[PDB]
Design a protein around this ligand. Structure first.
Ligand code: ADN
Length: 574
């Protein structure tokens, strides 16, 4: 419990170092792998461990007379390293090791001068995200370290620390008056979804291979509705919000719509917070929620609600027909979509409604892929309750004995074939831009042995203006078309940050913990894959050649955005 607090700070602190490094120090060149002149204030124990140094000295010149020292376990062009000491800072001066709060005060404080822009909210958010993490750790701190990985839902609920490179991972600014512990996957949160009785004339249903009626069936047991009516459901938090609107009030006071209880299915919220998982239900429920959670506000905007539909119909046309050109793609359907809005409301309203009431079903792929056989990547490669990459002990148990270097490179290599081949085939063959970061990705495994890397999330999916866009069957609202349209370098920036800096960087960092020498080998294995896959592509790919030949990699900046998205340029690992 004090231990708990201290684990949460080390995670939240390392998370923040990751932003600082990747988003400022490496791109703006404030980083040096060198010992300081004076060590006064840094205790031997911080950098010497009896035998040898605790790794490599890392130094940042934060351009305001402030200096930062930290022992890292490796040199890394992406910033992906393990921090093997506390953090120390200077002025004059003498090195010091301030508590977590003043340590955040101060790092942040410097980040602001480097970015010219300040965010007082972000600060209070950082401590919030950290405080939750304590509670989280504290609640789960007695479990087998790797239990998260044993089971799909549990891996959706063992992402104890959130975004590895994010200043406020667990911060969820909804009305504090609605709690926090009861809407957290990480507290094993469960809840019967909030429902509403609405008349069938306002329904907007998008289905693919599914009857309008079957979509409804998916979201809510349609029975309790009187005829001419239907049952939508929402996040219970969304439900309070959505009921705040003068508009809805009116609707309620006029019995145009009935507010049923939290009376829907009992589901568990997923790591994405507003998606819900019912075991052996054919679908997840991906509802909206007007709350900032990490970056954005998790509404399905009205146009996004149309586009899921098209993307699904797209992904099937392709999977059905263009198999070979997809490098092995496995994707979760988003086959059905529902929203409601008063029959006669005029579109500033109609829209507003459909985005409050928006719902999207995702195929519960655990049915195709087996509960105990599929693990959410972000968790696959996360640090468990002891700040130890869970992947290690998971594999050690699946492969009987401890795994030598070459086992680990093999493993890594089966993995990354199956993440790279589909993402990149999708991009260059079709202009379909995916968002394959750690959370948008689920590993399917035959007892350790990677089978598929399932991808999902059509919100994230965009289409390139020269290519991807062409699968758009043109009678599409100009606003919808606008949400899908990525410029091809806009788009390649995403694919780059996602596969490389968010996903594999981290996959690597997880496996090579304790064995940094594995890092560079792994990336070299990456680079061959890059070339072999290219050899296979059926369209040109200059940006790929660029990358293979070691040109710099795009990296989305989480912290800088919140302070002043912006992508910065990080040196290739090769
Ligand atoms: N490594 C990650 N990258 C992107 N999103 C993540 C990551 N880990 C967790 N998430 C969660 O996934 C959602 C982003 O789609 C957010 O709710 C975010 O908090």
């Amino acid at each position: 419990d004090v231990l708990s607090r201290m684990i949460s700070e080390k995670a939240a602190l390392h998370g923040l170092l990751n932003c600082l490094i990747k988003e400022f120090a490496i791109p703006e060149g404030y980083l040096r792998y060198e010992w300081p002149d004076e060590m006064k204030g840094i205790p031997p124990g911080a950098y010497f461990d009896g035998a040898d140094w605790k790794g490599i000295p890392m130094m940042i010149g934060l351009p305001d007379q402030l200096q930062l020292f930290v022992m890292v376990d490796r040199r890394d062009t992406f910033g992906s390293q393990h921090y093997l000491s506390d953090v120390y800072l200077r002025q004059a001066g003498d090195w010091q090791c301030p508590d977590f709060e003043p340590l955040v005060a101060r790092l942040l404080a410097a980040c602001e001068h480097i970015a010219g822009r300040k965010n007082p909210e972000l600060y209070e958010q950082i401590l919030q995200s950290q405080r939750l993490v304590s509670a989280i750790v504290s609640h789960n701190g007695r479990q087998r370290a790797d239990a998260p990985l044993q089971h799909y839902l549990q891996s959706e609920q063992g992402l104890w620390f959130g975004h590895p490179s994010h200043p406020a991972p667990k911060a969820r600014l909804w009305p504090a008056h609605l709690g926090q512990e009861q809407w957290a996957p990480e507290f094993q949160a469960r809840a019967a979804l909030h429902q509403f009785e609405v008349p069938v004339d306002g329904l907007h249903i998008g289905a693919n291979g599914l009857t309008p009626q079957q979509v409804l069936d998916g979201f809510a047991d349609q029975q309790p509705a009187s005829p001419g009516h239907a049952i939508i459901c929402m996040h219970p938090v969304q439900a309070q919000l959505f009921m705040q609107d003068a508009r809805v009030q009116q609707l309620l006071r006029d019995n145009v719509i009935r507010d049923l209880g939290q009376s829907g299915r009992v589901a568990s919220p997923t790591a994405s917070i507003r998606t819900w998982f019912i075991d052996d239900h054919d679908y997840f429920i991906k509802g909206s929620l007007n709350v900032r959670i990490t970056n954005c506000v998790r509404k399905n905007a009205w146009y996004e609600l149309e586009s899921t539909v098209l993307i699904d119909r797209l992904f099937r046309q392709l999977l059905d027909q263009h198999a070979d050109t997809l490098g092995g793609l496995v994707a979760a359907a988003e086959p059905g979509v529902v929203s409601w809005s008063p029959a006669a409301a005029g579109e500033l309203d109609s829209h507003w409604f459909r985005e409050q009431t928006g719902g999207i079903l995702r195929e519960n792929f655990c049915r195709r892929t087996g509960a105990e056989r599929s693990i959410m990547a972000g968790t696959l490669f996360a640090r468990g309750v002891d700040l130890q990459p869970m992947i290690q002990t998971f594999l050690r148990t699946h492969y009987g004995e401890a795994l030598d270097d070459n086992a680990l490179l093999y493993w890594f290599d089966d993995y990354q074939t199956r993440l790279l081949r589909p993402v990149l085939s999708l991009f260059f063959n079709h202009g379909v831009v995916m968002e394959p970061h750690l959370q948008n990705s689920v590993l399917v495994h035959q007892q350790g042995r990677p089978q598929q890397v399932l991808l999902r999330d059509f919100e994230g999916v965009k289409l390139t203006d020269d290519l991807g866009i062409r699968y758009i069957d043109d009678d599409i609202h100009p606003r919808v078309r606008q949400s899908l349209l990525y410029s091809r370098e806009q788009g390649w920036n995403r694919i780059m940050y996602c596969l490389f800096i968010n996903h594999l960087s981290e996959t690597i960092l997880a496996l090579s913990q304790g064995r940094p020498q594995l890092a560079p080998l792994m990336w070299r294995r990456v680079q061959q894959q890059l070339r072999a896959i290219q050899g296979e592509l059926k369209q040109p790919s200059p940006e790929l050649d660029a990358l293979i030949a070691g040109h710099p990699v795009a990296c989305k900046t989480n912290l800088k955005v919140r302070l002043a998205a912006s992508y910065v340029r990080l040196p290739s690992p090769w």
